[model samples]
Target: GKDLNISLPLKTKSIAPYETDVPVKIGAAESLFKTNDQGKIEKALVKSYHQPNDTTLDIELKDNIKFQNGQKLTAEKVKSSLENSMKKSDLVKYSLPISSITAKGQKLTIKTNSAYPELVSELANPFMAIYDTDAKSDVNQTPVGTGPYQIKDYKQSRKISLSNFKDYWQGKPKLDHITVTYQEDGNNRVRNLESQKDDLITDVPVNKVQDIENNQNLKVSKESGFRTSLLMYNHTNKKMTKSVREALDHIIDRQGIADHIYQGYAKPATSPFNDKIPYIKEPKLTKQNIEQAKMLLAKDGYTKEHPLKIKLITYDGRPELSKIAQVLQSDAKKANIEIDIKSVDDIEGYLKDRSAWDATMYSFGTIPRGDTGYFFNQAYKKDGAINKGDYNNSNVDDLINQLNHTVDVKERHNISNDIIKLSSRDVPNSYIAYNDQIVAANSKVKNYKVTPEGIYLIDYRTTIE
Candidate 1:
């Protein structure tokens, strides 16, 4: 059978690209534009876009593309899809400052509330992926898009089976069918691939990368990823003062963790944006100084008599995260900080319960749209939907607002660097490591590589013997 079986680490709540439950919304639906492996924007559904001014743009659609529903792609459909996305996707609704979108024949005009320089990059994310606007209610059941594959059956959090779409714009897919399964255990996923039960697996553990590399029948592919692993501080807590936060940041040995625990699979994060970003200067990683950490905490009224007790939370599904949390706990002990490690099985539930923990060790894609706007806005702004730690910085907020209106590439780059510099000083989160997205495959599988954004891409180019 010309079938491909893939084991993914994270579970999907819904196959719909814009659905609230969708974790990393890419593979399900395609957008007007997509970023290439070189990080350059390329046309996908859109033939081209004309920017008349900072705040306005005219998008031209490719007339040849057709949705899986057999409806031809048109300007009206594109307009409708974007409007629907604005309603369904949090990233689109919050990041975009669009005033209105209108369509006439093959041209779609978009007017933003402000300059919004990152609008095009933001639209490239799968969250803003074009969909058949007429099938809004049935999206959860059957997503309608112009992707190379169509969903055959979807069992939430378990398995999703798809069949190659004959009319895919990229041409017919080589694999007749593909099945994606959610397997939380990294070792288990690797074992499945080795046993020939699975063709490929994602999220290979740092330790297991070597095992797969040594296996004659297996191959491992990895890419520097966009995800940043950091320690988030709850600013709402009275105990979490500026001095304490700074001390904690210094106490974290980023290099040690990347060298030891991660086994060189990750780079110690110096800034939110990886070093791969253009014009981004790598900031100095914080060195572990137990005495200085203790001194700073003591100045903030934390002492041996009254140790700064912190409740740190982390999810255990990844397995590596739990190990990272353990290292953090042990590291904090040297500074006389009492750490309480709490493991949660459900990330969604923990995020909802605001009082679950005082701090959290988590990994999130800091630059999903190839811009700083997405990360700063969602993580630092007071009104941000994902601002669980109650982080509020007016200066950061002002810079983010300025970034939206700055259209010049040079000006935007400068402003983005300013944000990074200021945020580093603020110490909202302790930078930890930048993990690589690992994709392990059987030797028979060919042309299969995972995206840096950690989204699975299986198309006509992918094949298995």
Candidate 2:
């Protein structure tokens, strides 16, 4: 009998950061970093990749490994792959300023733009992983990677199968093969799980979580994540002056939204890190008080005659946003404020038309790197690609610059705490509740672990009976 096999669906797009906008896929090659059960990084392929005061972080690769294309996996190849990626994509450009990747005497060193503490975790990104030399330019064409399994078949929007790579460097994979396919629809996914057609499913819609809990062989598991849904304001617009954005924060109820819209899966949060960065302490900034909000608005020159009225937009994918908008509409009405709600368009349309919306509900995720500096640098800073509202602050830019260059954990912690506090107080955006991902799996799936960032981490070693 052959070893176990697995199957997955053709997810959205290319996982290579430079190859596509979608997140990268997991494969056989050992990731540079690994996270433990407590959501802490436990293993990194490199012995060590960083040296303070040394602008470069050197990575010493384990000797004697073979690539999928039968070439020796060496420090030079890894460097070539990274440099090639840098030349090809925008994603890598955003990450490049942090360090210069170079090879020397079996050691690959990363010279930093500054001393970064979470350097290894940043290396964990699948996009940054080494790839086959054949596709140094066309990575999407040759999805071959250093994994225990090799891609055997790919069908767009249908299924993908992986055959175990017998000559894998670590050891032969235990699984014979894997076939992955997407569930037809919400109802069909639940039906297949009940009919024993599928062994694991990624999401258990809140409505279906109850039914799945009753199955003797099935179970539901959830992991907290740093992902948060927040009210993103276009601050410079006349309808939403900075003071008005601040007033809106006091009028909306974060706890109420979590309780009603997410069905208790969210926690009201004040900082982007929530529990991810332990040192950042958030003072309870504001509460749902209409009169106080109005008083604050009055001091900012907002009169009853010039009341703030703006359109609130959210997408259908997350019905919670619409629900929260409704709650906010009712609450703001009590304070003589005006909020008009709108439905979301397709993502392509949204990205193109982001500037048109006065305010929108948006989601951002925190990775194992555990820094909010990136968020501000990318969104609130002038060069940020995602900066739709054109938010800018000189103080924030300076602090983020320092945070990125410092190696001292204590100093970083102190600075990070201040950044979060100031960002909240400045009303860059209204902080919202952090959300979680729920999964239901049959007993056949074993060695399962959930990541804090809510991504499914499965490799050839992941097995099903």
Task: Go through the candidates in order and give each one's C-alpha lDDT.
Answer: 0.78, 0.64
Off by over 4 Å in 2: 1-11, 19-31, 47-52, 88-91, 113-118, 136-138, 149-161, 174-198, 235-238, 291-313, 316-322, 329-349, 385-388
lDDT of 2: 0.64
Tens-digit lDDT track for model 1 on 269-356? 8887788786876667788898999999988888877899999988755657878889878888888899999876666457666676
Cα RMSD to the true fold for all candidates: 2.2, 4.1
Each candidate structure's TM-score, on Cα atoms with residue i matched to residue i, is 0.93, 0.82
Best by lDDT: 1
Regions more than 4 Å wrong, model 1: 20-27, 317-319, 451-453
Pairs in steric clash, model 1: none
Displacement of residue 415 (Cα, Å) in model 1 is: 1.6
Q: Candidate 2 lDDT, tens digit per residue, 1-465?
A: 333322232243444434532223435444556555566664444555546453656678766566666666678877777776667654455555655666765688776665665555556655466666554333553355666666555564356566777777767666676555654244456667777676666545556778998988888788777677788887557667766887788888887777876788888877666764567687584667888778878876666677667788775444355668888888887666778888644432464464577887776664444656556555777646456566778887788778876778788778877777676667888878787766667767765556675543555456666
lDDT of 2 at 30: 48
- Candidate 1 is scored at a TM of 0.93
